[PDB]
Design an enzyme around this catalytic site. Structure first.
Site, short mmCIF file in Angstrom:
data_model
loop_
_atom_site.label_atom_id
_atom_site.label_comp_id
_atom_site.label_asym_id
_atom_site.label_seq_id
_atom_site.Cartn_x
_atom_site.Cartn_y
_atom_site.Cartn_z
N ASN F 220 -10.41 18.09 13.66
CA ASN F 220 -9.23 17.20 14.21
C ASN F 220 -9.73 16.34 15.09
OD1 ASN F 220 -8.16 19.11 12.56
ND2 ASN F 220 -6.72 20.09 14.30
N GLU F 246 -4.16 -6.19 6.27
CA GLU F 246 -5.15 -6.73 5.64
C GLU F 246 -6.06 -5.41 5.22
OE1 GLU F 246 -7.39 -8.62 8.79
OE2 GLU F 246 -5.98 -10.42 9.09
N1 LIG Z 1 -8.72 19.27 8.58
C1 LIG Z 1 -7.95 20.19 8.90
N2 LIG Z 1 -7.13 20.78 7.84
C2 LIG Z 1 -6.41 21.93 8.37
C3 LIG Z 1 -6.15 22.29 9.49
N3 LIG Z 1 -5.16 23.06 9.76
C4 LIG Z 1 -4.71 23.46 8.57
N4 LIG Z 1 -5.35 22.78 7.59
C5 LIG Z 1 -5.40 22.87 6.28
O1 LIG Z 1 -3.76 22.70 5.87
C6 LIG Z 1 -3.50 23.56 4.78
C7 LIG Z 1 -2.27 24.00 5.00
O2 LIG Z 1 -1.21 23.32 5.81
P1 LIG Z 1 0.29 23.40 5.98
O3 LIG Z 1 1.17 23.33 4.62
O4 LIG Z 1 0.63 22.58 6.91
O5 LIG Z 1 0.50 24.95 6.57
P2 LIG Z 1 2.03 25.42 7.07
O6 LIG Z 1 2.22 24.74 8.32
O7 LIG Z 1 1.99 26.95 7.18
O8 LIG Z 1 3.16 24.89 6.02
P3 LIG Z 1 2.81 25.62 4.41
O9 LIG Z 1 1.49 26.15 4.34
O10 LIG Z 1 3.18 24.52 3.47
O11 LIG Z 1 3.82 26.89 4.41
C8 LIG Z 1 -4.65 24.60 4.50
O12 LIG Z 1 -5.12 24.93 3.23
C9 LIG Z 1 -5.61 24.00 5.48
O13 LIG Z 1 -6.88 23.70 4.88
C10 LIG Z 1 -6.87 21.44 10.57
O14 LIG Z 1 -6.77 21.68 11.89
N5 LIG Z 1 -7.75 20.66 10.12
N1 LIG Z 2 -17.12 -20.48 13.10
C1 LIG Z 2 -16.20 -19.20 13.39
N2 LIG Z 2 -15.78 -18.58 12.44
C2 LIG Z 2 -14.75 -17.77 12.43
C3 LIG Z 2 -14.24 -17.38 13.80
N3 LIG Z 2 -13.48 -16.43 13.63
C4 LIG Z 2 -13.55 -15.97 12.42
N4 LIG Z 2 -14.05 -16.84 11.78
C5 LIG Z 2 -14.53 -17.03 9.93
O1 LIG Z 2 -13.31 -17.53 9.77
C6 LIG Z 2 -13.20 -16.85 8.17
C7 LIG Z 2 -11.64 -16.81 7.92
O2 LIG Z 2 -10.88 -16.04 9.05
P1 LIG Z 2 -9.55 -16.73 9.36
O3 LIG Z 2 -9.09 -17.73 8.40
O4 LIG Z 2 -9.42 -17.30 10.85
O5 LIG Z 2 -8.63 -15.37 9.25
P2 LIG Z 2 -6.78 -15.82 9.35
O6 LIG Z 2 -6.91 -16.39 10.72
O7 LIG Z 2 -5.93 -14.62 9.31
O8 LIG Z 2 -6.57 -16.86 8.35
C8 LIG Z 2 -13.70 -15.41 8.39
O9 LIG Z 2 -14.50 -15.02 7.30
C9 LIG Z 2 -14.64 -15.37 9.68
O10 LIG Z 2 -15.72 -15.14 9.34
C10 LIG Z 2 -14.89 -18.08 14.85
O11 LIG Z 2 -14.46 -17.89 16.06
N5 LIG Z 2 -15.70 -19.13 14.60
#
Ligand SMILES: Nc1nc2c(ncn2[C@@H]2O[C@H](COP(=O)(O)OP(=O)(O)OP(=O)(O)O)[C@@H](O)[C@H]2O)c(=O)[nH]1
Ligand SMILES: Nc1nc2c(ncn2[C@@H]2O[C@H](COP(=O)(O)OP(=O)(O)O)[C@@H](O)[C@H]2O)c(=O)[nH]1
Ligand SMILES: Nc1nc2c(ncn2[C@@H]2O[C@H](COP(=O)(O)OP(=O)(O)OP(=O)(O)O)[C@@H](O)[C@H]2O)c(=O)[nH]1
Ligand SMILES: Nc1nc2c(ncn2[C@@H]2O[C@H](COP(=O)(O)OP(=O)(O)O)[C@@H](O)[C@H]2O)c(=O)[nH]1
Lengths: 50, 128, 430, 431, 431, 430
Positions: F220, F246
């Site tokens: 986690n 994006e």
């Molecule tokens: N990556 C990750 N997976 C987890 C963790 N804890 C539980 N799991 C997974 O979650 C699955 C089941 O989760 P849940 O459905 O929420 O269990 P629950 O809260 O008792 O709810 P129910 O099982 O549906 O009754 C298990 O198969 C685990 O593999 C965790 O801390 N990290």
């Molecule tokens: N020369 C220059 N290019 C930039 C800069 N910031 C972003 N870019 C480039 O501009 C391109 C387009 O980004 P932009 O149009 O600004 O994003 P938008 O504002 O969400 O439309 C990207 O591919 C960036 O690599 C800057 O400060 N200078």
């Protein structure tokens, strides 16, 4: 106590003062000025970082 | 159920183009702008405004309409247009107007056909 | 010599009067108690032998709370105690209640005080009546007072700065009803009626002043600034002086058509100030922008009949002429065919004073544009269907009938508003 | 200076009124001894609406307690704020009505009603200007419903133009306390339809649900429900007692709420009701207050507004707030839930703003909704009344106290007609 | 007295515009607070070309900042010269265009374009005489490309006669930043061909190459690339702002550069770009400036001019220099490289001279070349666009914004026809 | 303005949410009490007038134990008490139990709280749904919640960080069943599904962090670091910002193909830290390592459609461009012929914060590589035979039938997964 009565240290709570104030425009203007100053300070900090 | 998508990609409706009589009527009527794309050029409602102004000079003035892409200005143009249409007696369908403002394919085409029927001597569009 | 009698009816009237009188006291230097440490106050204040200046105003309301707020506020020593008139029972959003039953004794006493006030004025440009179209106090009592004023005073110019209901946003439910009734009443009594909409002024505050939470105080401050700019030619000198009587003669093409859109410029906060030139041309353009209208009525829909401009501050006739010529050449702005000039420019040398604690900045130039344009028929069109939609079911009709009204009054008011629509359409058409 | 005469009826009404007067005395800064310890000018500015000045600084509530058994009044007098009420305003009988509307309206309510009207007249004539009367009582109880309807009729006869506001505790849908609740409710609703200008429906089960779900109170006492009711009863009239940016009195609310004279029943709710756990977590904004306000669970009437259609709705906000913000929130609510709002009224909202929030709360908002959803509650009451009346169970007590059987039929017919009107305006179409 | 209205679009456009305004303010001696601190008459002589005087001595740039996300202009306002811009000229949406030309041109660009045009008109009417508008933005981005093309179309509609200048950052050949760069570039080129009077192409990889090879910087951030772009953008218009021995405005450059209306794409470069170490070893002479000027490494565009033929080329020199020296250098370049110059134009060079060099540099020169080499850039972008469009990948994002599939084909056809015209004039023979 | 609502369904969802919110509190300086000693927290936290910051999260589960662990642990004063939503009976690893019988009231209350949360957000980039495909609650209730969110909210981008059963190792028996059911459900609702496998994350923990006994807390923590890297561009500024909208635009070629492999780099303990250069090119190569995948799915089998790179810390565009050019020139890394660019690079200037008590070291640079590639069809291929192997005998099918399901639901889910397989084959093919 009354459930409707908010507890102390809550966003809902206001003292007896700040109640009966009856001044909305002044409070909004003061908050606006404070927010403007804080925003300018934040921009200054970001400028320094850049 | 059978699908026709390219992994969920639905192609645009690809509605048929305007009728030649409608296009000729629009071209013969004097307009500053041109129908390049029906959807794009009619969504704003400015071209419809010019057509209504040509057919009714006193009623429709160009200054009341604005050539803007915004939903607000488009709605203002189309709402005053519908108000004049209701006052005169012309039938301007609201569903077609809304599809035109939202750029639904074929809505502007059907609207132009309806206006061509309302104005150009009811020369029913040659269908089927 | 140039006295103007101010009347403020209802909560809206009194709350805009608070802003107006704060602005006037600040502009003339008069302290809230009445006296200040020539004769430019005479338009709004009458000075006593002791040196204290009392305003020529009358605060009328059927609810005691609003008037008692003034009696207990900072301006308790300014206004005349008898000039503040308080009712006992509110009109309860009822035009009949404010026009037939409760309003009688109140309007009698109001006419008594208005007689006394006018007897103290050598000249009298007219009355500035600020009421609330959409409430029983403002609509009913205001209509009755306007009728009585028309009866007794006669040809004195009554300028009614009315607040009409906004298109979509509103605070009352019987607002279309009493608005239609009051409009029928004041179509034939007020000389120049100025429309104001809370929605439009809220949008102005949100967009121009960057106030995300505008309030009634801000709205009233804007309205007070408009009225002060309107009256500036009476109190302070400048080239192209314009008078209350001249407002009509240059604005009211026909007696029925006397409703006016109002717009102030510039509306900028202190932060946004001193970043733009704020030239005469720019402020005139801002005044003619549709968003700057204080009425939810897009002027592009109609055609301008007359436009009266009040300029304040460092404004030169060169600049006003150039700006107005550009406005005329503008294609978006359109004037009626039968009004070639349609412009009434008036300059004043006194810049608009700023209320401390407000949002408006200190600007050296200001424009108040008050226009007669046929687009104003749109708001009447909205109220005319909002009225009949309710009137079909006769909802809230028993409330109006209970205080001595009849269904015939509703029918007459609706027909009169329809006739006003027809007149607007006719004057718009060639 | 627009006075209101408060009346409490029955045990439930007396308890609710005691809690309400405690809340108002706290809000105006009045200690249980009546002296002013409130520390604000605005508190004493309009204290005359609910209180009168005694010999000294003591303030006597303009309240009248009415009952047929002295136990409830003895408990109220022994309670924390039992000493503010004038002892002459306690009008009690000697034998209580055994949950019998007939006993509370004809046999035993007749003798005490003379004293009750005497006290009411003495209180009302002292008022400079009278907005009206507010009567708090419970439908489905003998003495409460009986003298409530009787006194409401008498006050309607004496003061026709003066306002009548009622807070009736309609018997709850699922859990019923007494057996004859449908009989008493059927007899009382018929009276309220004719007499009461403005009627406010409260249900104990709706109160339990709201205080168990929003407040997350697990075992709520009757005091808690009474205190929620008290908060609503204060907030409905705070525009009279305090300066407001856009104030609205009781008559303005009634005019903006009641489209037709018989459709004067309302469901109400209070905001912001927050559980103690989430009090720091909740941030008070006008949109938050409106979101909690328009929730169906927030309504103190059991009927949920989703089934019906909002004819009208007034909201009295309290606190330093933006009128633009409030108006925008209400317009947005109307636009989003236009399906739930009646079409032939363009604006179904009466928004009022008072500048003085209640104690402890930065902002508050009390809601008053006139919607056709009340149809289902009256329908349920009729469903129980008809079932009982078909077999004439428990009818003999009401018969032996001296009403014709035809009174039951007339009351049922009137309630059914009211239900029919509500359905008519629920499914009415524009044009 | 010939004003220029600057517009910045998208994140890249806004950053470039902020750097440009910083450089121009440095050149005119303007501090970030708006006051003039240059101590030179010529700096204030033509400051009205870019700036407007406020109520005080403050100077506000005639710049308008566009975006659909507020974060980029929050960064702009936090930038070194974020405080010069008028706060009203910041026009922002709330949800950015997700690198979607359709979103930035039709759905989200439609609403904000009102404010954009309103601000543009407000700035333009204040101008006494208007040379035109210049828009800095990046092809291959949602808000930038979409909103920029939409605004350019609107401005072409409103002011056809006024000059239109575009600084477009075309997607780089080798390393692409976003996946949909070919779609956005293809859709933007179609608009720029029809609307933009004069358009200049910049590539991030070309700027990286020039700053790695000529400047020999080790870690060039986007700031350095924006610095070079700002240098070119200032140098193109320095003739408007300063006295020149042979001055030439934007319209004159466009007239002498654009043979046919559709062939208005130019590659630009700045001289002298010298590595910090070799600054002492390099001697500032007009021949050295021309030698660096015509070197294909100096172009900020990926396409190298050697592959194509120079249709036209304008060279704006700055500093105390001999007109004979400059003219002889340009003629010698033409004669030596006559293979790279088009035959049916007797003189392919528009030489301009300005007396004011950039601060610190004794001399400088900016180059604007119209050559058929840009054909290969458009060809590569079309190669990517066709590859993606054949399988219709990422087409659903554009389709869901209400864009017809026919529009992609129209834009591709326009781009291919532009390529065809470039080839036609590359292989066109005299007589 | 950039608010993102987090939903954590089931035990795995809540247990990865614990790590995620610990990481966010550490990143933004928020103490566990709720308040910190700007506005970068607005994406994950909403501030009250009291100054205390509360997350915009919803812990949904039908079992009380997992939620009560949060209510009792350190972050009891942080999370909203009502936002923690608890059921009475567990789903018992039954998709039918969590989707048809027990999940109804729980999902109703969850939508109520989610509406209350979204009403507090000015903007809304989207939803981050963290569930466990392979358990009744996460699969069934999560699928029902996703369907309701699609119905009501509509176009809001829902990013589902799903955990599918690992190829060989697993902890449930009906895991293939409810996994297939939930996969059929969320193929048509989630916008981008990020694929995670416990086996692959165990591989990462053992090989890279040298943890011989990896556990759920470590898994986690890694997932939390990945999600923080993904959302970093929303909260902290940098060159090449990437937005939630994006990701889908530059990562999803077609609506059906939106499942993404995720890889983090570097994954190094403090012991091994500062012992290699950890350059941009090296961390990019590590991110493209098939071992660094968090799904037991070798990318060599398939072809990359798109690769979004999220760089955190001291990262420069020259270096990211050089590394991506090297990756393109590399032969083993193979892209589809219809995606020539296939890369979405985005940089952030905020280095990844280190969780005290965790195994990850303080590294100045980090990459989160999230890729759409056709190899992911392999995991669906494994589940597709694991499902039908039991379904031939209809083992454990009566359990699903008892809670309001039918044979048709299983058949439809299997056919839909086969269709998804065919779609992956078709997109991979020329
Ligand atoms: N990556 C990750 N997976 C987890 C963790 N804890 C539980 N799991 C997974 O979650 C699955 C089941 O989760 P849940 O459905 O929420 O269990 P629950 O809260 O008792 O709810 P129910 O099982 O549906 O009754 C298990 O198969 C685990 O593999 C965790 O801390 N990290
Ligand atoms: N020369 C220059 N290019 C930039 C800069 N910031 C972003 N870019 C480039 O501009 C391109 C387009 O980004 P932009 O149009 O600004 O994003 P938008 O504002 O969400 O439309 C990207 O591919 C960036 O690599 C800057 O400060 N200078
Ligand atoms: N612009 C503006 N409008 C206001 C203001 N205050 C009140 N209004 C408007 O005034 C209308 C009602 O005013 P009034 O009739 O005076 O209210 P009242 O004083 O309680 O009297 P009645 O409503 O008639 O009983 C409302 O619809 C508001 O829209 C204000 O401060 N500014
Ligand atoms: N909310 C509330 N309800 C009550 C209270 N006391 C009684 N009730 C309810 O009111 C209903 C009617 O009882 P009531 O009228 O007081 O009995 P009566 O005085 O003998 O007529 C009963 O069903 C109770 O459930 C109280 O203090 N608060």
């Amino acid at each position: 106590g009354n459930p409707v009565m908010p507890a102390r240290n809550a966003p809902a709570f206001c003292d007896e003062y700040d109640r009966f104030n009856r001044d909305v425009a002044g409070e909004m203007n003061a908050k606006k000025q404070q927010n403007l100053q804080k925003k300018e300070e934040v921009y200054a900090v970001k400028r320094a970082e850049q | 159920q059978e699908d026709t998508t390219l992994f969920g990609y639905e192609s645009p409706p690809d509605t048929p183009a305007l009728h030649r009589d409608v296009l000729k009527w629009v071209q013969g009527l004097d307009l500053s702008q041109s129908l390049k794309n029906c959807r794009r050029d009619v969504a704003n409602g400015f071209l419809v405004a010019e057509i209504f102004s040509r057919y009714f000079p006193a009623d429709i003035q160009m200054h009341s309409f604005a050539n803007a892409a915004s939903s607000h200005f488009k709605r203002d143009n189309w709402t005053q247009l519908q108000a004049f249409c209701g006052r005169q007696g012309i039938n301007l369908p609201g569903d077609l107007v809304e599809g035109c403002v939202q750029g639904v394919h074929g809505a502007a085409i059907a609207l132009l056909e309806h206006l061509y029927e309302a104005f150009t001597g009811k020369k029913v569009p040659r269908l089927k | 010599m140039r006295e103007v009698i101010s009347i403020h009816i209802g909560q809206a009237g009194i709350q805009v009067g608070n802003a107006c009188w704060e602005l006037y006291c600040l502009e003339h230097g008069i302290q809230p108690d009445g006296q200040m440490p020539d004769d430019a106050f005479n338009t709004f204040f009458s000075e006593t032998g002791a040196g204290k200046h009392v305003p020529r105003c009358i605060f009328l309301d059927l609810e005691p709370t609003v008037v008692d707020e003034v009696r207990t506020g900072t301006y308790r020593q300014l206004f005349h105690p008898e000039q503040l008139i308080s009712g006992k029972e509110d009109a309860a959003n009822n035009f009949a209640r404010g026009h037939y039953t409760i309003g009688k004794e109140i309007v009698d006493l109001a006419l008594d005080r208005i007689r006394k006030l006018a007897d103290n004025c050598t000249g009298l440009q007219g009355f500035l009546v600020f009421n609330a179209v959409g409430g029983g106090t403002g609509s009913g009592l205001g209509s009755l007072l306007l009728e009585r004023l028309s009866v007794d005073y006669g040809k004195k110019s009554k300028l009614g700065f009315t607040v009409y209901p906004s298109p979509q946003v509103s605070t009352a439910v019987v607002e279309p009803y009493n608005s239609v009734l009051s409009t029928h009443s004041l179509l034939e009594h007020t000389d120049v009626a100025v429309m104001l909409d809370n929605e439009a002024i809220y949008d102005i505050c949100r967009r121009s002043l960057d106030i995300e939470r505008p309030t009634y105080t801000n709205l009233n401050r804007l309205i007070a600034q408009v009225i002060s700019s309107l009256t500036a030619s009476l109190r302070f000198d400048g080239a192209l002086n314009v008078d209350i009587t001249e407002f009509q003669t240059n604005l009211v093409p026909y007696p029925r058509i006397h409703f006016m859109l109002s717009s102030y410029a510039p509306i900028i906060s202190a932060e946004k100030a001193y970043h733009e030139q704020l030239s005469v041309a720019e402020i005139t353009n801002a005044a003619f922008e549709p968003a700057s209208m204080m009425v939810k009525c897009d002027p592009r829909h109609g055609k301008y009949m007359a436009c009266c401009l009040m300029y304040r501050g460092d404004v030169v006739p060169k600049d006003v002429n150039a700006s107005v010529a550009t406005i005329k050449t503008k294609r978006t702005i359109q004037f009626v065919d039968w009004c070639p000039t349609g412009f009434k420019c008036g300059i004043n040398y006194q810049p608009p004073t700023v209320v401390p604690g407000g949002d408006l900045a200190k600007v050296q130039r200001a424009v108040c544009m008050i226009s007669n344009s046929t687009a104003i028929g749109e708001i009447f069109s909205r109220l005319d269907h909002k009225f009949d939609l309710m009137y079909a079911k006769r909802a809230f009709v028993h409330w109006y009938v209970g205080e001595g009204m009849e269904e015939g009054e509703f029918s007459e008011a609706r027909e009169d508003l329809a006739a006003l629509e027809k007149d607007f359409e006719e004057v718009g058409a060639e | 200076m627009r006075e209101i005469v408060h009346i409490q009826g029955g045990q439930c009404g007396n308890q609710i009124g005691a809690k309400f007067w405690e809340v108002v005395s706290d809000e105006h800064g009045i200690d249980p001894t009546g002296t002013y310890h409130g520390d604000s000018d605005l508190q004493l500015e309009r204290i005359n609406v609910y209180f009168n000045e005694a010999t000294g600084g003591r303030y006597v509530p303009r309240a009248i307690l009415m009952d047929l058994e002295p136990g409830t009044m003895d408990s109220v007098r022994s309670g924390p704020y039992g000493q503010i009420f004038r002892p002459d305003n306690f009008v009690f009988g000697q034998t209580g009505a055994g949950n019998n509307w007939a006993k509370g309206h004809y046999t035993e309510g007749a003798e005490l009603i003379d004293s009750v009207l005497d006290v009411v007249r003495k209180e009302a004539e002292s008022c400079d200007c009278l907005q009206g009367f507010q009567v708090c009582h419970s439908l489905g109880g003998g003495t409460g419903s009986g003298m409530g309807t009787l006194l409401i009729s008498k006050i309607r006869e004496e003061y026709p133009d003066r306002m009548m506001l009622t807070f009736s505790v309609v018997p709850s849908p699922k859990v019923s306390d007494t057996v004859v609740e449908p009989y008493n409710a059927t007899l009382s609703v018929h009276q309220l339809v004719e007499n009461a200008d403005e009627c406010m429906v409260l249900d104990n089960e709706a109160l339990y649900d709201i205080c168990f779900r929003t407040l997350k109170l697990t075992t709520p006492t009757f005091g808690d429900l009474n205190h929620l009711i008290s908060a609503v009863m204060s907030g409905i009239t705070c525009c009279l007692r305090f300066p407001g940016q856009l104030n609205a009195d009781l008559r303005k609310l009634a005019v903006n709420l009641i489209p037709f004279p018989r459709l004067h029943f309302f469901m109400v709710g209070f905001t912001p009701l927050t559980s103690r756990g989430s009090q720091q977590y909740r941030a008070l904004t006008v949109p938050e207050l409106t979101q909690q306000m328009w929730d169906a669970k927030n309504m103190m009437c059991a009927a949920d507004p989703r089934h019906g259609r909002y004819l009208t709705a007034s909201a009295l906000f309290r606190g330093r707030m933006s009128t633009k913000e409030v108006d925008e929130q209400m317009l947005n609510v109307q636009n989003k839930n236009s399906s739930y709002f009646v079409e032939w009224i363009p604006n179904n909202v009466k928004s009022s703003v008072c500048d003085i929030p209640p104690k402890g709360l930065k902002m508050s908002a009390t809601f008053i909704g006139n919607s056709t959803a009340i149809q289902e509650m009256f329908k349920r009451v009729s469903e129980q009344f008809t079932a009982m009346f078909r077999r004439k169970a428990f009818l003999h007590w009401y018969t032996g106290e001296g009403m014709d059987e035809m009174e039951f039929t007339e009351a049922e017919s009137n309630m059914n007609d009211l239900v029919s009107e509500y359905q008519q305006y629920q499914d009415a179409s524009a044009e």
